[PDB]
């Protein structure tokens, strides 16, 4: 069905301008929906709008029904256990003394026992793969890899959603891929959706649901193979298309049309191969 | 002519460099993950003097013994602009921020306002946005101003640390366009990119390092003829270079290895043909 | 900071903090000869039982010998007098205050010897968890105890991070042309203050960042957690416990009453 809908709203920082204004949207149950658009305008405050750290300037017409819980401030600490968030910044997000400290600082706020919470600590942190690296300091790990014991903390609390603000942003194209590869098993394993509110639209390549912001309102949401051919649009908006899509205007410019369901490398090959053959 | 012989820095580590970079051409120096880019970052205007050897820099000498006076003239010459540059704004009004870099170097104030002006309007910005505080500027424009404060002097040589490092397409886009443009101009710039595909994309000598010495020098052209290499030193390849080797997994040929985005387009339209 | 393998580093920290505190009590206690020997005697046998090398003690004493010597001095020329071996324009060189000179100077000396082992059997960490514990009583107020724990935690692995920035910003700014530390003292009020914002204004932020994060993922207070690194007391624990009580006995059988 619908898990995350925020209808009607619209968010003015504490203040020149609205910087989400009339926003309407829905998140499907279990599907990887990402949100893309200019800088500012939205992207930045949706993360900590969902979880209730922001507030709605005008509470009367909220609409925030997150899992069937609709968000105020009398229940936001159970939206806080339903949604987790992986920011931005990797460096000062590491809170904790070490690894196995910083994964297990939810089981340790949520007052269970300590065995179980090494036995989940111990299992958590050999799913993302952090297993060599379970005793090791925050100064000895290397960028990427904080991201990922970050991850394992959202991972232990066992959420419904888990939503990444920018959280490849500040990472090197390679260990990029290694973090969305892990989200995407993650995400086959533990059944939870994935909101991935990224600039990068490598993400949103591989989405099942993509969502443009314009200047605070919705603009188009579909499928990437629905909305990327429209190349027009993301260049007046202000952002470029991505590597398969480039490529095929590349191709289309150069004198040759190829179908516009192709979506990735996969298939593209195949099209190419199937051209020359024919 | 930047000249490095027998440069080690000890005491991250740097050890055994030898190698000579020419004026008037782009470099990339790629590097793994903390293997020595940062500290040969430092050298380049005697931030972290040699403990051997010999730099030789735009007609200037460093050696290991050559003291503190007189470096204003070197730090001229060769500029240096560091990663996240949003935390170094320093002044109240961002005129008097880019004018503070030539204020150090004996420009009179008609000609540094003139220099921050000109040079505002090459990255851009906007017009109206020259008189706000620093401190006020929104997000990726706080970038587009600091960089100004470092390219106000016109330095000969300018090297960069990571300078998209968290901006969208668009702007890396515009940024390393902008840099290009700069570089046409007759100076050099030292590009430090993870980003492998802006490496392919705009370089001509690119300064492959790692564990803290000097492996490859040579042009983008050459370093990425072996994939089997990239593997076994731990660097990435762009992203055209992977698509071409998938498709030639596939069993089509390709005139020619491309590196760019109409290089690849080309070669696939003369293989079809 | 210095590992090893000496029994001394398998005993809780929280039973070395309460020996420190024993003992410094014990120094500033000891006001006699007898007293004054068992105290340096038993500093001594703990040193010898740490197996460092007096080196790692020596040169960690070494920066704080301007501070002890000149007190001693100080209290010294208080109250001498006696004997005279030669006599200046001024000063008489008085020689009888030596009889208990030396003896305050060794009291510093073995208060910071004890201070040096404390400082080098066991990483900050568990200093600040046995500070915690040993703080712990305090509940009886109003204000906790946890939290206090908890942003001492942070901010002992933050204040590298900031001093870094510190570094990276202060290279910066050099790069692009200042000058700060050859423009002697008077160009320090036109280059560090008007620099000081903007690193503080960064802090402040990280800040902002981290109490965000902790927020969102549930930080419901500081009262219904349940902590996960432990430190429990071991039978070993015992051995630092009586030697206190061993000092004790020699401590009330030789006071000067």
Redesign the interface.
């Given at each position: 069905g619908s898990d995350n809908i925020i209808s009607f709203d619209h968010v003015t920082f504490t203040s020149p301008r609205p910087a989400l204004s009339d926003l309407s949207f829905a998140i499907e149950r279990g599907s990887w929906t990402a949100l893309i658009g200019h800088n500012g305008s939205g992207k930045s405050t949706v993360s900590?709008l969902i979880?209730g750290?922001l507030a709605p300037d005008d509470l009367d017409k909220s609409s925030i029904t997150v899992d069937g819980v609709k968000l105020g401030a009398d229940t936001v600490?159970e939206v806080?256990?339903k949604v987790?968030?992986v920011?931005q910044?990797p460096?000062?997000?590491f809170?904790?003394?070490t690894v196995?400290?910083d994964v297990?600082?939810?089981?340790?706020?949520?007052?269970?026992?300590?065995p179980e919470?090494?036995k989940i600590?111990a299992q958590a942190v050999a799913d993302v793969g952090m297993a060599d690296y379970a005793d090791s300091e925050?100064?000895n790990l290397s960028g990427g890899q904080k991201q990922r014991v970050a991850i394992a903390?959202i991972l232990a609390?066992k959420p419904q959603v888990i939503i990444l603000d920018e959280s490849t942003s500040m990472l090197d194209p390679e260990g990029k891929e290694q973090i969305l590869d892990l989200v995407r098993k993650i995400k086959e394993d533990n059944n939870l959706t994935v909101i991935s509110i990224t600039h990068d639209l490598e993400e949103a390549a591989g989405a099942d649901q993509v969502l443009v912001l314009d200047d605070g309102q919705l603009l188009d949401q579909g499928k990437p193979e629905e909305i990327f051919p429209k190349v027009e649009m993301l260049k007046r908006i202000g952002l470029d298309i991505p590597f398969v899509y480039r490529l095929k205007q590349l191709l289309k410019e150069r004198g040759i049309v190829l179908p516009d369901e192709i979506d990735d490398d996969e298939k593209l090959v195949q099209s190419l191969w199937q051209l020359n053959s024919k | 002519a930047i000249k490095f012989e027998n440069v080690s820095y000890v005491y991250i580590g740097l050890d055994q460099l030898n190698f000579s970079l020419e004026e008037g051409k782009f470099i990339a120096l790629v590097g793994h993950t903390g293997s020595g880019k940062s500290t040969l970052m430092?050298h380049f205007?005697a931030?972290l003097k040699p403990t051997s050897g010999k730099i030789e820099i735009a007609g200037y000498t460093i050696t290991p013994e050559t003291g503190?006076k007189g470096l204003?003239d070197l730090?001229?010459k060769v500029?240096?602009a560091?990663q996240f540059?949003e935390?170094?704004?320093?002044?109240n009004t961002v005129l008097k921020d880019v004018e503070?870099?030539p204020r150090?170097?004996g420009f009179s104030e008609d000609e540094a306002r003139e220099a921050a002006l000109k040079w505002l309007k090459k990255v851009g910005l906007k017009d109206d946005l020259i008189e706000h505080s620093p401190?006020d500027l929104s997000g990726g424009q706080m970038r587009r101003v600091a960089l100004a404060?470092?390219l106000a002097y016109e330095p000969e040589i300018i090297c960069l640390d990571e300078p998209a490092a968290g901006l969208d397409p668009m702007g890396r886009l515009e940024m390393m366009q902008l840099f290009k443009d700069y570089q046409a101009a007759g100076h050099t710039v030292i590009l430090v990119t993870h980003n492998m595909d802006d490496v392919a994309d705009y370089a001509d000598d690119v300064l492959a390092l790692e564990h803290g010495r000097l492996i490859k020098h040579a042009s983008p052209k050459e370093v990425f003829k072996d994939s089997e290499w990239l593997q076994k030193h731990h660097l990435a390849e762009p992203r055209s270079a992977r698509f071409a080797a998938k498709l030639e997994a596939a069993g089509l040929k390709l005139p020619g290895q491309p590196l760019t985005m109409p290089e690849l387009a080309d070669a696939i339209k003369q293989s079809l043909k | 900071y210095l590992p090893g393998t000496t029994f001394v580093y398998r005993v809780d920290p929280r039973a070395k903090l309460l020996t420190t505190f024993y003992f410094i009590i014990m120094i500033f206690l000891a006001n006699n000869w007898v007293s004054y020997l068992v105290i340096s005697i038993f500093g001594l046998a703990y040193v010898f039982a740490t197996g460092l090398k007096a080196r790692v003690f020596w040169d960690g004493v070494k920066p704080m010998i301007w501070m002890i010597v000149f007190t001693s001095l100080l209290q010294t020329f208080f109250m001498a007098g006696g004997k005279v071996y030669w006599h200046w324009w001024i000063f008489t060189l008085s020689s009888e205050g030596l009889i208990n000179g030396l003896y305050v100077f060794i009291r510093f000396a073995m208060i910071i010897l004890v201070s040096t082992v404390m400082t080098v059997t066991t990483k900050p960490?568990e200093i600040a968890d046995a500070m915690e514990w040993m703080l712990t009583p305090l509940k009886l107020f109003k204000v906790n105890v946890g939290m206090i724990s908890l942003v001492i935690?942070?901010a002992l692995?933050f204040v590298?991070?900031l001093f870094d920035?510190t570094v990276?910003?202060m290279?910066?700014?050099?790069?692009?042309?200042?000058?700060f530390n050859?423009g002697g003292l008077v160009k320090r009020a036109k280059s560090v203050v008007?620099?000081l914002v903007?690193?503080f204004?960064?802090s402040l932020e990280?800040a902002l960042?981290?109490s965000?994060?902790?927020?969102?993922?549930?930080?419901?207070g500081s009262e219904?957690?349940?902590?996960?690194?432990?430190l429990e007391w071991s039978k070993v624990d015992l051995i630092p416990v009586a030697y206190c009580l061993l000092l004790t006995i020699l401590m009330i059988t030789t006071r000067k009453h």
């Open positions: 900590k979880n750290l600490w806080r256990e987790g968030i920011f910044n460096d000062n997000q809170v904790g003394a196995s400290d297990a600082f939810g089981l340790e706020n949520r007052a269970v026992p300590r919470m090494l600590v925050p100064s903390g609390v | 430092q205007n931030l503190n204003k730090r001229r500029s240096l560091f540059s935390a170094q704004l320093f002044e503070y870099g150090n170097f401190f404060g470092v | 960490l935690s942070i692995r590298p991070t920035q990276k910003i290279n910066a700014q050099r790069s692009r042309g200042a000058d050859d008007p620099m903007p690193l204004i960064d990280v960042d981290l965000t994060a902790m927020e969102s993922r549930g930080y419901k219904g957690r349940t902590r996960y690194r432990i």
